[PDB]
Design an enzyme around this catalytic site. Structure first.
Site, PDB file in Angstrom:
ATOM      1  N   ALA A  23       0.301  -4.325  -3.998  1.00 39.79           N
ATOM      2  CA  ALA A  23       0.216  -3.047  -3.317  1.00 39.79           C
ATOM      3  C   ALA A  23      -0.136  -1.977  -4.331  1.00 39.79           C
ATOM      4  CB  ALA A  23       1.535  -2.722  -2.611  1.00 39.79           C
ATOM      5  N   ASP A  24       0.635  -1.913  -5.413  1.00 43.82           N
ATOM      6  CA  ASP A  24       0.369  -0.958  -6.483  1.00 43.82           C
ATOM      7  C   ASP A  24      -0.989  -1.226  -7.167  1.00 43.82           C
ATOM      8  OD1 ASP A  24       2.496   1.049  -6.700  1.00 43.82           O
ATOM      9  OD2 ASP A  24       3.883  -0.605  -7.096  1.00 43.82           O
TER      10      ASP A  24
ATOM     11  N   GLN B 113       6.265  -6.865 -14.104  1.00 39.14           N
ATOM     12  CA  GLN B 113       5.227  -6.635 -13.088  1.00 39.14           C
ATOM     13  C   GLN B 113       3.999  -5.964 -13.692  1.00 39.14           C
ATOM     14  OE1 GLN B 113       8.415  -5.126  -9.693  1.00 39.14           O
ATOM     15  NE2 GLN B 113       6.286  -5.459  -9.029  1.00 39.14           N
TER      16      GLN B 113
ATOM     17  N   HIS C 111      12.123   0.076  -4.182  1.00 40.40           N
ATOM     18  CA  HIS C 111      11.564   0.579  -2.926  1.00 40.40           C
ATOM     19  C   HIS C 111      12.476   0.448  -1.709  1.00 40.40           C
ATOM     20  CE1 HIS C 111       7.711   1.950  -4.215  1.00 40.40           C
ATOM     21  NE2 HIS C 111       7.622   0.899  -5.013  1.00 40.40           N
TER      22      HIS C 111
ATOM     23  N   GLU D 272       0.694  -4.094 -12.519  1.00 37.82           N
ATOM     24  CA  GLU D 272       0.396  -3.429 -11.258  1.00 37.82           C
ATOM     25  C   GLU D 272      -0.675  -2.361 -11.362  1.00 37.82           C
ATOM     26  OE1 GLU D 272       3.807  -3.115  -8.736  1.00 37.82           O
ATOM     27  OE2 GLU D 272       5.072  -2.615 -10.475  1.00 37.82           O
TER      28      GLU D 272
HETATM   29 CO   LIG Z   1       4.747  -2.381  -7.128  1.00 36.51          CO
END
Ligand SMILES: [Co+2]
Ligand SMILES: [Ca+2]
Ligand SMILES: [Ca+2]
Ligand SMILES: [Ca+2]
Ligand SMILES: [Ca+2]
Ligand SMILES: [Ca+2]
Ligand SMILES: [Co+2]
Ligand SMILES: [Co+2]
Ligand SMILES: [Co+2]
Ligand SMILES: [Co+2]
Ligand SMILES: [Co+2]
Lengths: 252, 256, 253, 253, 255, 254
Positions: free
Chosen positions: F174-175, F147, F45, F149
């Site tokens: 966030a995801d 991760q 990101h 998510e």
């Molecule tokens: Co994420």
């Protein structure tokens, strides 16, 4: 922030160096692991600037080899900029007389000892003010090495060697041989006689002599004469010659 | 390592040039194939430095077009650095008198003929010492072109023309027109007279006159008067003007 | 953070564009002042990456000309990255059918409308969370443009034009003419017939037709047929051909 | 082309600034949206050059915050180059006397007013000759600020204030404190006394006083004394101190 | 736009190469004048990308040494990008079977022979459309070299050798030795046997065998067996080893 | 070449981290001296690539803080490239099931244990072949963090935890909040419940839980629950918010 290169020189410990002209933080890291005592980041004859000096200093940082930087000229402005990105040992080209040597020294020291510009809040040199009392500790860890590279410089050597703050005096044989009328032939006996006389004269004053020479036998001779920082090769040359010889062995 | 641009000027062969201000090795290569005799890498008025000059020289290298570099000033240290990355033809701005011209010449020459610093193992110029006799051959292949750009410089032109090692004299019409009180208007008759007078004086001396001018009819006039290195356009201008004109041929659009 | 290119397509106002392949933030700025409605930063056929796209977006930002970015492929990961540096209008190459068009759309939309990865604290797109309600506003300001560039895509145009979120359909004449057997010759009658048929077909669906074409008379024809985003030149070509013509006027001729 | 920093200065509007030493066009953009009146791109003490100054100017351009650039020295050549990439406000370091101040002014003005070299066709400053009549309007939009940073400069201040074209006079507390024997301690009462005296002389002469001070209480004190361009923080410091505090809050006490 | 490396391989002229991992257009130029027949810009194991490949291609251009580029994978999109900045000779890693070899070939050719995307107006490859009929001439000047780097790939060599447009087959000894259970060290009898048999089989098929090996005695042996593109050293190694030996002669040691 | 971060996680020592999205080797150095146990170079990101990861690793090297790198996707080729410039700890986004976890692990290991490509001579990772027996020692110093998510990943968590080589499991709020229907509001009780359940579940399997959260009170709670690698801030946010607050104290008005 103790300058270990400076301490070694003051202690009379000979330091073996490599000259870096590839102007790359990547090959700098590679060469930082090669075993040299010091590495010279050349801002005079290689396409370096303050920004590329910074990245090479960052690459070299975790290794035992100590960085030395040559500005393109004895310019207080450029010197200021190089010191702020973290340069502590400086090899200043074409110092011709004691006044110029004094100005090189003054360029590295905060007032009242010199005229180094103050900007500790954004200098890597102070780790952005993480180093406690950086401004009070900085001057004593600066190591100033001046290059003598002409006949005129040789005439003024006795006075240059009386300048306080000059830690070392470096003989530049390419430039000297050219000024003496033997361009490209520093091995000539007349140039060698001037070089050997100067090395002894520098050591005799209690200051550190230095030199760059690609001939390994000459390098050993200079060390025998009391040279304390001797650069014994150049990265561009090591790479070019090794590559050429390899290609040739296969008939290319 | 012989300097082919220098040889062409010495022989009296006109050389047509383009000015490069885009400060990109990519567009430098694109323009190097366009058929110009020479390309000017502008280190004075474009955002170039020694490092970007190097990459532009590398880009241009395989092409027939010959590179010329304008340093930002008549400064021996910068000149040393430009020469070591391989610059052989220099177009020095704001040369006001013969003392300055001489200093430009000396900055490009090794001792005893000048004060060029010696660092051949590190230099693209010597191909990292692959050229065995580099130090002995280098001086003679340097081509020094000085820019005369003020009323003062014009007054000193006869003496400048006597300086050994000045291979050409270049008139800078933007700076000259501004110094003469006609900024942005080199088309003005008083400026044009000083320019034509200068080209003729240079020509009669045996040295090469040069100039940059975007007006193609003036360019042809200067060539007729004996100019030998004439830059006939600027990359930024060519690009901007062609783009602007193209957008304009479509104009504002009707909402439907 | 309004997408004015998107709004213009919706107003029905044609937008005249220039293709950028010089891969430089410097020449991007120079060209941003040249008076085009839009500029295409080409990530497919010019040496650009996410990083150079970013600096080109920064260069262009203060000017009226709106940026559009072509990724190198319909790749959701690359699309994620380009959006996060602030890209709001995408021109996706080689979209061959409706499945691929839907995947391009979904790549640009946060869940549940799509699969765009969430990283707003880091993103220029949200101005580092300076923009309020960015995550709730972002989907609707995305403008997805898909390139049809092969006989297969041309055949599948009807299905593609039924895809929600496809704001425009762009014909790529270089790839199309090659796929049709006329490489280097988009002006061939057979290629032009396919192009014109497509433009009309797209216009009728209510979606915006687009095209890149260097011949100005053809561009005006495509505008006449209802095209809404037409690129009429390429920076590399403009510079190269202008330089070449200039040198030649002083050469042998 | 209108220099709005200069306009504000001339109107007597106090302008609040942030010093930028991160030498990045990316963090420059992030900081350009933070609400400062001005941003100082430090060419003297951060690893910047003309090229990185350019990219930071491009990044900052679409925001309200106005850029000011500190060259590494009062050098006409560097100044020429900085002006051509679009710098209109300069903060010149170590101006020691009136002659040096006049040379800073002259370096920013075209002939016959000064010695600024003319290269408008390829300058971002003229938008590549898209600004008319650039050469006739440029001189009046240059804003020259000189830094007084030693006891010698303080002595010469009356004369420096008399130099036409010096729009503002900036006190550099780090350099001044060191020059006065209190390196690292501009907080010291005697340094403060010298600073406050200078602000008065400057204000009373009708020119704009300026200063950088990271201590917000002292900044407000300087503003109250009549300073008109005050930089109240440094990006490197803000970042370093904020990160250090966060880490420590999750460590022992 | 004639690909002279390709022409040399077809003529049976052995090409001696150097591997470039310093990822610098400056050292690329310095090495381009060292006398090698070819130089490998390594996009798989060195920190290069399409942009750095471009700058290295530009640095190398005026010299006789011919550039070859290894993409990071057999990826048609990356291949498209590398070709457009001017790459004409590709060394594709981890080609495991004939299908994958065919896909590498097709990635380098315009329709109808392949799927290379058309972008000639802004490509260095066509010199921005100065090369006339570039689109009609490009395919024949592409040189596709596939790397066999596993036991599986070795098993599939006969079929890979039958793929039209595969101009050469390169043995990757570090990856092959690892796959064979020798942890990247190819100086074992059984690895050597596998390499030597492969070289002979490739040459007998009428294609060019290639290999990288830093041991000069082995390189000479592979040339004697008919290898036609042999890389005989790596820039990072030459530099590191030269420097370390030099420091060691003055007592300065990193070991 | 020992991975000290990996050893800490194994030992159950909590590691406090800062997320790096400024994509600069200069600010990376500045933040490397700030006191964190680890620093996350975000390749997903933030505008990073292999080359910028390399220069940040170089900047960070002489500091105590340990680098972790997030690739942009679970892609073996990108992972190969990141490892060769010297990455030893990876934080892989969007790992959805055991197959994906297993493939992340295999991407970091030389044969026979994985499919990591061999290029030691020109890798910073081996310091250009100065690290003795690098190829034999590399696998055991790789630290793979996956991760989770999405809701799907949550459902598959027990099997993911059962993949050998998965050293840690990181929750991406966030995801995760977006996939759950609360985009932009991780604080919502339903997201928090999912997060807390996952953390205990991870700790109970013997592996290390991780998370990123800018709210310091929540961070402390996750640590109390047994989270072992917790990123407590983001460089861009730290800088933007501190600059904005400063301007505002001098009159700046939105
Ligand atoms: Co994420
Ligand atoms: Ca004495
Ligand atoms: Ca000869
Ligand atoms: Ca318009
Ligand atoms: Ca066969
Ligand atoms: Ca083990
Ligand atoms: Co010298
Ligand atoms: Co001029
Ligand atoms: Co296309
Ligand atoms: Co100061
Ligand atoms: Co391999």
């Amino acid at each position: 922030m103790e300058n270990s290169f400076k301490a070694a020189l003051k202690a009379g410990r000979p330091q073996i160096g490599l000259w870096l002209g590839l102007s790359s933080s990547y090959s700098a890291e590679l060469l930082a692991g090669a075993g040299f005592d010091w590495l010279l980041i050349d801002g005079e004859h290689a396409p370096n600037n303050v920004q590329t000096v910074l990245t090479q200093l960052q690459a070299i940082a975790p290794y035992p080899s100590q960085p030395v930087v040559a500005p393109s000229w004895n310019d207080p402005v450029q010197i200021k900029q190089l010191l702020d990105v973290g340069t502590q040992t400086l090899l200043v080209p074409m110092v011709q007389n004691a006044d110029e040597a004094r100005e090189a020294v003054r360029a590295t020291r905060y007032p009242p000892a010199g005229i180094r510009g103050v900007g500790s809040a954004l200098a890597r040199a102070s780790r952005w003010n993480r180093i406690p009392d950086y401004l009070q500790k900085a001057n004593d860890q600066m190591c100033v090495l001046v290059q003598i590279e002409t006949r005129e410089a040789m005439k003024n050597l006795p006075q240059i060697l009386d300048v306080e703050g000059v830690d070392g005096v470096f003989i530049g044989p390419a430039d000297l041989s050219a000024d003496m009328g033997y361009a490209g032939n520093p091995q000539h006996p007349e140039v060698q006689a001037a070089i050997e006389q100067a090395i002894v004269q520098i050591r005799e004053s209690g200051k550190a002599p230095g030199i760059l020479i690609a001939n390994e036998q000459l390098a050993k001779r200079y060390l025998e004469l009391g040279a304390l920082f001797v650069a014994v090769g150049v990265d561009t040359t090591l790479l070019a010659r090794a590559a050429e010889a390899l290609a040739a062995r296969f008939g290319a």
